[PDB]
Amino acid sequence: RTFSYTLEDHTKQAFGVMNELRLSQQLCDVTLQVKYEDIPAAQFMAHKVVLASSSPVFKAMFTNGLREQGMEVVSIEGIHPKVMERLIEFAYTASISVGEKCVLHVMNGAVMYQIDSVVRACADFLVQQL
Amino acid sequence: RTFSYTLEDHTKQAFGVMNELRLSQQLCDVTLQVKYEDIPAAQFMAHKVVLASSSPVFKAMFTNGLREQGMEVVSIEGIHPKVMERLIEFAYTASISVGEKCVLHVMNGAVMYQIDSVVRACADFLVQQ
Ligand SMILES: *C1=C(C#N)C(=O)C(C)(C)[C@@H]2CC[C@]3(C)C(=CC(=O)[C@@H]4[C@@H]5CC(C)(C)CC[C@]5(C(=O)OC)CC[C@]43C)[C@@]12C
Numbered sequence: 001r002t003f004s005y006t007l008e009d010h011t012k013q014a015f016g017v018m019n020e021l022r023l024s025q026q027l028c029d030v031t032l033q034v035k036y037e038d039i040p041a042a043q044f045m046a047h048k049v050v051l052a053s054s055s056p057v058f059k060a061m062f063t064n065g066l067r068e069q070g071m072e073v074v075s076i077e078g079i080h081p082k083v084m085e086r087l088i089e090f091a092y093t094a095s096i097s098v099g100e101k102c103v104l105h106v107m108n109g110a111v112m113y114q115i116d117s118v119v120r121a122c123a124d125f126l127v128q129q130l
Numbered sequence: 131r132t133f134s135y136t137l138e139d140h141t142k143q144a145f146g147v148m149n150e151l152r153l154s155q156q157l158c159d160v161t162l163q164v165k166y167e168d169i170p171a172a173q174f175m176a177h178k179v180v181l182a183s184s185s186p187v188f189k190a191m192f193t194n195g196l197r198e199q200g201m202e203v204v205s206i207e208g209i210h211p212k213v214m215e216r217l218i219e220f221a222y223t224a225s226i227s228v229g230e231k232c233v234l235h236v237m238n239g240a241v242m243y244q245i246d247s248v249v250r251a252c253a254d255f256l257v258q259q
């Protein structure tokens with residue numbers, strides 16, 4: 001007959017493997033230069049595919065049909081490198097933690113990239129504190 | 131304290147987006163010229179990263195200091211173009227289905243690529259029947 005297999009935790013474990021690959025600075029086809037006022041530039045390396053899977057705004061960045069000898073390194077202004085880190089991390093972990101006092105800056109970054117899943121999480125939280 | 135948030139769906143959802151991006155030849159960074167028997171070259175276009183996430187053998191191919199960030203071509207012997215396809219599917223869908231005619235032949239590709247998950251599930255069904 002016809003045989004079918006589905007491995008349920010496959011999307012989980014392949015991500016942490018992909019996330020390893022990031023931490024390993026391996027297979028990374030983009031490097032993010034996150035400039036925030038006087039804070040010294042922080043370099044975040046990643047794979048475009050994973051960013052583009054987790055951000056609409058990033059998908060449009062790489063699949064803009066406009067790239068050649070360039071755009072390997074992208075300039076991020078107006079995010080604090082530690083906010084951006086937890087965003088980028090959320091893309092690879094599916095989870096985010098943040099000391100509750102910067103929820104609105106993590107919300108503000110997440111909007112910049114349309115991480116609508118945490119933009120809700122963070123706004124709900126903000127509202128409960130009131 | 132710390133505010134924490136997880137979105138279990140994200141791993142299912144993101145991979146669908148990459149399978150989309152795969153199916154559109156959007157951010158595909160590698161092309162697998164699968165050359166089996168006298169069947170001519172069959173192109174499979176994919177992203178090294180997703181391939182590397184599913185197959186220990188594939189990660190090994192790419193992190194083998196290829197040093198080649200451009201589009202790579204990769205000639206593939208020993209796997210039928212249609213067995214290769216069934217795995218590339220597992221890579222992005224997390225699932226795979228074939229008739230019993232090829233359950234063993236697809237098992238060989240999964241063995242060739244250390245997809246120990248379908249290797250097992252291939253074997254089990256073979257044993258059941
Ligand atoms: C706040 C946290 C908490 N609790 C965190 O968990 C973070 C994610 C580590 C976060 C990183 C971003 C900054 C450094 C931050 C708190 C701040 O006060 C920072 C300020 C906010 C503001 C409004 C005072 C001016 C910008 C600034 C900054 O430039 O100072 C470094 C941005 C970064 C941040 C929001 C924590 C530590």
Ligand SMILES: *C1=C(C#N)C(=O)C(C)(C)[C@@H]2CC[C@]3(C)C(=CC(=O)[C@@H]4[C@@H]5CC(C)(C)CC[C@]5(C(=O)OC)CC[C@]43C)[C@@]12C
Pocket residue numbers: 167210212213216227228229230231232235236
């Ligand atoms: C059998 C399927 C089934 N059911 C499939 O769904 C596959 C995975 C698409 C599979 C692709 C590979 C071949 C073409 C195949 C049927 C076969 O029997 C083919 C034979 C197997 C064998 C041992 C009889 C001799 C080699 C050969 C072949 O005929 O070369 C083209 C290899 C390919 C395949 C296993 C299906 C369609």
